[PDB]
Symmetry: C3
Subunit: 340 residues, 3 copies
């Protein structure tokens, strides 16, 4: 009866540039595929659907998780990869993205890009002629949110995404906030964006998400009031208050505004939910064991920044499950779009 390849047909050869380009059913399919690939890998029965494929991984910003997740997922699936890091390439200074896309599209079967304006990854996606995957831009981080939604499903009992309530605290207009809001809207979830109003997401993006959420039964709340924002949440999520590519000056501008939105044990208690779970895309500043994190926190008399060591290392934290799921979801994206 229901066994169908139509949906798989439609994903073939698509780019993965942002979640606004995908239907609710497409996103769910990607999540369900991710789950199946994760099980097959743990059961030792994984089938290689990217055998003989060559993939280019362009990184104009630093990465640990995203880069490793692309490499491992390709290797498990039978593909090879060429990593092109932030120096040593011609890209940007000597060669246009239009030119780079057409050259790489002649040699590789798929291309990942992490960098700056969403406009750049969109040009790559238009000119390459092979599938292009967004591994983070200034505006959106779509692979992260797939991982996050898989993680929420796994750490819930008998709930679909549409039944889940969560809050994101801090810099709500960074890539991860934007993307969470879009995904929540697509999947019918209840999202609260909790932070200072100057860092709320763009009004046009919010308006587009609200129109989406009207059709899916989702809810989107923006607030500066933590107690109101987190009450009843299944998950609390945060990220660094200053993102890659922004000025180091921005710490001075932001810490005093962002400080009330730190995820500490008080915040978890304000949920009223003893089963609440803590998520963070990573990397995180939760103590003095990084150079940047230590310097900033020392300057403001803090121990951690966006999250405390106590929350980050608690039984409530599921950040490493979430990080592992980067790899399974990126795999699903590659298999769906390029798998054969």
């Amino acid at each position: 009866y229901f066994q169908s390849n139509a949906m798989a047909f439609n994903l073939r050869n698509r780019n993965f540039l942002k979640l606004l380009d995908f239907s609710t059913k497409e996103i769910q399919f990607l999540i369900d595929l991710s789950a199946d690939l994760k099980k097959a890998k743990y059961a030792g029965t994984e089938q290689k659907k990217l055998l003989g494929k060559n993939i280019a991984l362009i990184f104009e910003k630093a990465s640990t998780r995203t880069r490793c997740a692309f490499e491992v997922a390709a290797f498990d699936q039978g593909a090879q990869v060429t990593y092109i890091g932030p120096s040593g390439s011609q890209i940007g200074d000597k060669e246009s993205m239009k030119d780079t896309a057409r050259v790489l599209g002649r040699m590789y079967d798929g291309i990942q890009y992490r960098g700056f304006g969403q406009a750049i990854v969109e040009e790559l996606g238009a000119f390459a002629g092979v599938p292009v995957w967004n591994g983070l831009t200034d505006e959106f981080h779509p692979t992260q949110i797939l991982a996050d939604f898989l993680t929420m499903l796994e750490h819930s009992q008998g709930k679909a995404l549409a039944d889940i309530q969560f809050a994101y605290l801090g810099d709500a207009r960074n890539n991860v906030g934007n993307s969470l809001m879009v995904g929540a809207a697509k999947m019918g979830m209840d999202i609260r964006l909790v932070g200072p109003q100057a860092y709320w997401p763009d009004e046009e993006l919010v308006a587009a998400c609200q129109a989406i959420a009207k059709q899916t039964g989702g809810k989107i709340t923006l607030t500066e009031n933590v107690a109101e924002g987190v009450q009843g949440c299944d998950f609390l999520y945060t990220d660094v208050w200053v993102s890659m590519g922004e000025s180091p000056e921005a710490w001075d501008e932001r810490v005093a505004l962002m400080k009330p939105y730190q995820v500490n044990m008080n915040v978890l208690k304000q949920t009223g939910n003893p089963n609440v779970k803590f998520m963070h895309c990573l990397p995180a500043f939760h103590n003095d064991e990084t150079t940047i994190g230590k310097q900033v926190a020392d300057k403001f008399g803090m121990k951690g920044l966006e999250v405390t060591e106590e929350v980050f290392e608690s039984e409530h934290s599921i950040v490493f499950d979430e990080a592992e799921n980067r790899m399974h979801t990126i795999k699903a994206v590659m298999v769906a779009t390029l798998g054969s």
Copy 2:
């Protein structure tokens, strides 16, 4: 015949085109074409299976580096990329030593960098095949790609029947190599640019002696209209190459500017089927930081080529770039394959 050539190429380095016969070069081009077809037909045999290859890059690269990686992967090899930082090379360890160490662990080595003398020392000391992926003096894999492309875009002409011009900095690596390749294959090449940037007189003298025996012709001129009349292909490259000081732009642009490839130049060929080539990367508009800043300083739109030419139907630059991979593959398979 082609079996003779294949036998003679086994275990050789690929350091420059002066190290090869006319027939060896033709064989490499023919092998490139066979490997390209096999890849598109899905019938490619993996002749580098179980081989491990090191790729040393002392300068930046997109095309060359990817072409080496992809060709190796398709042929069943694995690769280690060693970029301009993070290795011991140059600052802590001599090239002689690096060569002897890598030659013990890898089955072949690519090098892109500075003096030709450095790739020659690597090629002498490694004890495994060493392939030049660009030096200050020569860029031999690029020219194989260019000759394959010319053949594909000509209708039943052999290389010996082709006439082409290279415009601009004629003494850079690509101009030197085009002149050598043209002489070896019996072609008619015009090098068109300011006389101070003509290739070295000893290199020209050697290429003229080669050309005498192949029926090739080599012309050096400052005059564009004269140099490009009747050409099948026009070719150019950036006017300041990697490793030269960025200061060079300041007094090189004005000097070079008459040698820009624009639509007037194409019209001066008298040839409605004329095709445009460029090794890439190219400065043809304001969508690069360097290209925009240098052009703005002179109020220009593109540098060595205009957007109008680069994106026209006469341009074959992306066919030429894809052919980098197929030709590098043939080099590796010929020298290291079994």
Copy 3:
């Protein structure tokens, strides 16, 4: 034996028995033979390995890559820039993330404490590819090389001297290895650069049980007499100050390995070793600047000794790969 090495980290030689070390060396010799005979069996097929380098490397990095590739594994090289490590993400966090995606992890970097943290938190085998304190893969390669270049001597029958900066990672590790394997080692250099007293004491206790001997001396003639091998390394290591050349050259100069030193062994078959990279002439930017400044031609070793029939440095370098292969196959192979 093989069973007991499965799933272990390889962080330093002090964590292993004499017999475990010998087994690793013997496995290295078997894998080397299989590779040259074309009969090598892939025991890491489908495995994915991460290679974290916080310092530069040519040999070590290449040896890990090639050994993985030959064994059917794939690798991700994470160099000193382009990752989140150190400035934006703690080692504890990096370890737990990588251990979820990879089957094994190599680390080259700074304090031993950092590799021990990685080893504790990753949850998969971790291998030390050089720290400030120890360099355990190098010494396996060195001991394989000594065996191959000796005729039917066991390690316990070998005498050797290490000259120069005896307290660097390589000296420390040579001393530990020698004590474990019952060898006679002389550390020959200025007293200020002798190894830590606590480390020496632990190695002496080990050596009493194996029949090894450890001598520290500032006298070259006494230190090198009757040696089978002479070994040296750069006088200033990665991560140390460039100012240290000013402090050290005058003190280290008398311990340069030149032809006189080889002659003081009284052994016409003496062999010369060096972990590499080496400063033996003016063909490196650092080596040339330093040597020019002090009116020298080579530093820790002369061109004459380095390129002589006595030098086995490139054999030693090739054995980096075969020994790293053994470590990976023993700890992760199936």
